[PDB]
Each structure stands twice: as structure tokens, then as C-alpha cells.
């Protein structure tokens, strides 16, 4: 069974646009999205479709790149660090729900490396 997906808007949360957040969407997210290992992470985990009935018994703060993309598009974040935290949550969730060496973990490991390469240097404000 699936919980509601994470919010992509929140009217009482303040919005912001920064050069770094623009970069996270245009360069970081959009490039990672095209990687051959991106597909499992392009939408929230569907526990019914993927037959993972224990997924949300284990993962209590789900995150995916579809959600991140919508958050960036809606200027949901206050700063780049907040967005980076969502990417890190996504990767960590994968390591938590699975085990070292699993195919899905190998995919997350590769994406995390590419992610770190890309956020090593961000534009200046």
C-alpha cells in the first residue's frame, strides 16, 4: 500500500529562486535524469506496482527525482542545500531498503557519484 507522495507545494512554506537552485534543475537534475540508471528514481516508489509491500514499512521519508523536479519547478526550496538533502535522502533510502551489491544499489551508487561530481562546484549567488 502506498502513502501519499511527498508534497511538491506548500503555501505556508516560503519560496526562493537562486542561481544554485536554477543550476540544480537545469544541469544537475536534468543531466542525471538522462542516465541509463535513472529510471527507478524518476517517480515515487509504487509498492503495489513493484510488489514491494514492505517498502513503506521500512522507508519513512521517501524521495525521488520526479518529486525533486517538481519542487524545483515550483520554487519550493529555500536554498540549494535543501534540495541536495532530498537527493541524499533518495540515495540513502535505496541503501536502507536494499543490500550491498543489489542491482538497484549499484544503480544508486553510480548516480550518487555523478551527482557529487556535478554539485562539487555550484555557481556563485
Ligand X SMILES: O=c1[nH]c(-c2ccccc2F)cs1
Nearest residue to ligand X, by Cβ distance, number only: 40
Measured torsion, CA atoms of residues 109, 107, 91, 85, in degrees rounded to the nearest 10: 80
Cβ contact 95:108 at 8 Å: yes
Closest distance between ligand X and the C-beta of residue 82, in Å? 22
| Site residues, ligand X (CB under 6 A) | 40, 45, 50, 94, 97-98, 104
Q: How many CB atoms lie within 10 A of CB 80?
A: 21
Closest distance between ligand X and the C-beta of residue 2, in Å? 13
* Rounded Cα gap, residues 1 and 43, in angstroms: 16
Closest distance between ligand X and the C-beta of residue 24, in Å? 21
If the CB atoms of residues 37 and 78 are measured against ligand X, the closer one turns out to be 37
Amino acid at each position: 500500500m502506498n502513502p501519499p507522495p511527498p508534497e511538491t507545494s506548500n503555501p505556508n512554506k516560503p519560496k526562493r529562486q537562486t542561481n544554485q537552485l536554477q543550476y540544480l534543475l537545469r544541469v544537475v537534475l536534468k543531466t542525471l535524469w538522462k542516465h541509463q540508471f535513472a529510471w527507478p528514481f524518476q517517480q515515487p516508489v509504487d509498492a503495489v506496482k513493484l510488489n514491494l509491500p514492505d517498502y513503506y514499512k521500512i522507508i519513512k521519508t521517501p524521495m525521488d527525482m520526479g518529486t525533486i523536479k517538481k519542487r524545483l519547478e515550483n520554487n519550493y526550496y529555500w536554498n540549494a542545500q535543501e534540495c541536495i538533502q532530498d537527493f541524499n535522502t533518495m540515495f540513502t533510502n535505496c541503501y536502507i531498503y536494499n543490500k550491498p551489491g543489489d542491482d538497484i544499489v549499484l544503480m544508486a551508487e553510480a548516480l550518487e557519484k555523478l551527482f557529487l561530481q556535478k554539485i562539487n562546484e555550484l555557481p556563485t549567488e
